[PDB]
Structures are given as structure tokens and as C-alpha cells.
Subunit: 68 residues, 7 copies
């Protein structure tokens, strides 16, 4: 919350269950850690795949960290 | 989503009729035109296809259980 | 409607993938709100083999998707 | 509603095939079941790597059940 | 009904993540938690004696009284 | 209480083996536990690929516990 | 003795946190709630022996396996 609030408009790293790695601009989030990201991208086997708008279910989120 | 319009609901509402990339638990990747959804994020896709080992498998009409959805991303034009 | 579309598949053959890489095909007879399923003339597809199972009841908790086979 | 219970009702006393999460394959005579799909099986056996392992009486939690199908014969 | 009959007898229990255990069933509850005595794990076909073991029902696949 | 409760209450102060989801194996002295089987271990250690990694004090979530076995 | 008391006394200290799917993280414990959700600072992931610094990280309790203050 605190942190997520401070990260609105910032790029965040998100990892999910089943070894998924995503980066995106955090636009919104809720208490269930559901997320709306913009200019989102998946990092798969070292390759970047741009996705654009992405909504993420919080149930599978492992962690979120604003990119330095 | 119900209590989740600001994160999940609005984008899904706005994606009706557009092609979306959906990833599911157990490494499944599906693309399809979003036609409908419910409170539990179950989805209705038309002209849906699975991408397995880089290969495309067309399936037509697909009902997807929201319980196993990881993310939904409308494909950039 | 997710509901109408499944209603429309009763009596038809559908593809159902489940958690843990399971792939099944069968005639959709019945289904409930939790997407539990009753399939007839069902079969399991495993490494390309087809194993006929006949009548099969499927727990919706582990269902990934259902699609009619054209 | 014929969905789960109907078939199960009709398979009592007959051999059934059940697969569970984590690739488990079991066969056995269905003696009873409930609304959570927990099952009681007798003369049960596991099929591991194509080999059969007889177990006898087995209680199975419905939570990990994938499907149940009465054995065609 | 089956567990009550198995109090005092050896049972085979398999859990999520491929775990296989045998032990004497001493008690159980409505959540399918088990208390086993003289319990042992079977791992790669080798047996590891453990003694007293309490097992959470949430991860139980099946419980089978060992014939005999 | 006759299943998990008694044994955990009876294991306070003793070395327990705890296995968790995803193949994790841990041993430690059981100092406390709560309603959901979250555990407090002291002198804890992880066993990985046959090697012991000492960790000291460890809080363990009950949600992912498979079993708890006092070491004989 | 309390699990709560233990985590409280670890605030400001480096902790090792492991999660489902084999994730291993280290970081300075700043905040935690009753669901074991965590706020770590100067956090880093350890992947195949490699350390990846991440900075501030919120960790969902739902997938936490264990939390141990680094001795």
C-alpha cells in the first residue's frame, strides 16, 4: 500500500508463480495486490516481449519492487 | 471483479471485442477476442488459439476459468 | 454469455484442458456453476495416445478451459 | 447435478478410474462419496509407471481429484 | 468412518509433491490432519524412520490402511 | 487438538524435522506455534542437496507445512 | 517466544526469505503484518548463486515459506 502508492507512475518489477517475470508502469493496485500496468513487458529466457496494458491477478504475485 | 473495477474491471470492460493475450497457471498461453467475462474473471474468447512450444493451435470458442488466470493483456495494435 | 455458450455445447464434443497438463475430449452432457462436468464418450489424450474412458465426471476446480471442437 | 453425484451414485459397487493432482492414477471399487467428492474405494490400486500396486481400502480427498470415470469394463 | 477403524493400524499416506509415508494411525480430525507413530518416509525406495509425525490434512492425497 | 495440538504442545523445546511444499526440508528446536501451525524454530537449519545450511531463528508458515516430526 | 515478537525484533535487520517456486531473497526487514506480507529494503534476489539487487520490495505473505534473520 504505502510502497505501492509511492510507486504509481513508476516502473515496477513483478514476479508471479510459475516463474513469470514482468515489468511495467504501475497505474493502480488494490488490497488483494491486483494490478493494472501500462507499457508492460514479459522477460522470458532473457528476451523482452512488450505487451502494453496488462491486468494482473494478485493471487499469483510473489513480489513487487520498484525498479531502481 | 466487483470490488476491483479500478484494477481489473475497467480494462476488461474496455477490452470487450478486442484480441487479448491471456496466460494461465502451468505455463499456458492463449490469445482470443474477449467477448465476455464475469465476477470471477471467467472469460469468453472467440477465435481463441493456444501457443504451445511456439506453435499456434486454433480452438475457436473458449471458456476460460478465471481462477487460473495470471494476467490479461489486450494485444497492442 | 459464458453460460449461454456452454449451454450451446451440450450434446457436442468439447476439448477440456486441466491443471497438470491433462487434455481430455468428450461429449458435454451436463455442467454446473462450479464448472464441474459430465462428459460422455470421453477420452484422455496422452503423448498422442487416445485412451477411451466413456462417462467422466470433471471437477471444475482443476479446469483450465473448455472449447467446442469444430 | 447429474453432473457429479448422478454418475457417482450410479457407480457405487463398480470399479472406477480416478486421477489426482501430481499425476496420480488410481482404480478401485467406489463404496461411497460425498458432496466434496471425497471418496471411499475398496480393492483400490495405484497405477505407477504402468505397474499396478494394490492398496485395499482407500479414502481419497476430493480436493485433489481431477476426474472420475467408471471403468467401461 | 474408515479412519476410526484404522486407529492403531498402519496406514499408507501420500501427500502433494510426491511424498509417501507409512505409520500407525493414532488420531485424526475433521480436517484430515493425522497423528502417526512409528512413522517413516519412503524416498527413492529407501525408508527413513521418523517416529511421531503429525501430518496436515490440506496436502493429503489419500490414506490407505496397509493390508495385513 | 488431539492431532496437531497435543504433539506440538508436547514438542516445545525439542528438535523437530519439518518438510514443506516444493521439497524443502528444515530441522530446528520448536519454541512456539500458533493456531495456523506457523512455527518458531531456534537453531534452525535447511537441508539442501544433502548439505546443512544453518539459519538460526526461523519463522515458518503453517500453510506450506507437510508434516512436523520430533527427531527420535 | 511469540512469532510476532520475533519478527518485531528483526525489524532493521537483514533477513533471508524463501518463497514458493524456489525463490530466495535477502533484505532489510522494515515492516510485516499478520499475513506475513513484508516490506524489505536493500532487497536482493539470489538466483543460481548470482545476487540481483532490487531495492524496495513488497512480498506477499501467501507465498512465503520461511523468514530467518541472517546470523
Amino acid at each position: 500500500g504505502a510502497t505501492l502508492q509511492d510507486s504509481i507512475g513508476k516502473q515496477v518489477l513483478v514476479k508471479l508463480r510459475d516463474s513469470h517475470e514482468i515489468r511495467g508502469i504501475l497505474r493502480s493496485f488494490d488490497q488483494h495486490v491486483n494490478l493494472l500496468l501500462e507499457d508492460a513487458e514479459e522477460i522470458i529466457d532473457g528476451n523482452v516481449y512488450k505487451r502494453g496494458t496488462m491486468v494482473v491477478r494478485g493471487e499469483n504475485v510473489l513480489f513487487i519492487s520498484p525498479v531502481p
